[PDB]
């Protein structure tokens, strides 16, 4: 049990690092997604804005 525990605890803590690494990567991907969404938004809106202003001519 000490060995199985060391493995369960080691695997748990390691896997917990995989949890925090995947989680961190998810947050970073979300910050990137957000930034991407923000740029998308900003561009579509900048164009739609400018286009509305410039529909005419």
């Amino acid at each position: 049990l000490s060995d199985k525990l060391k493995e369960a605890e080691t695997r748990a803590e390691f896997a917990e690092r995989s949890v925090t690494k995947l989680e961190k990567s998810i947050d970073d991907l979300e910050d990137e997604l957000y930034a991407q969404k923000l740029k998308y938004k900003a561009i579509s809106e900048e164009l739609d804005h400018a286009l509305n202003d410039m529909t005419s001519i």
Binding site: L51, M54, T55, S56, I57
Partner: peptide, 29 residues
């Protein structure tokens, strides 16, 4: 953009039309 292309032409037309009016009117006046 259709709005820009057309309305730019409309402003060009205000010039072209105003100019034709200016020229004809001035030719007589």
């Amino acid at each position: 953009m259709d709005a820009i292309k057309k309305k730019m032409q409309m402003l060009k037309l205000d010039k072209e039309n105003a100019l034709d009016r200016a020229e004809q009117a001035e030719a007589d006046k």
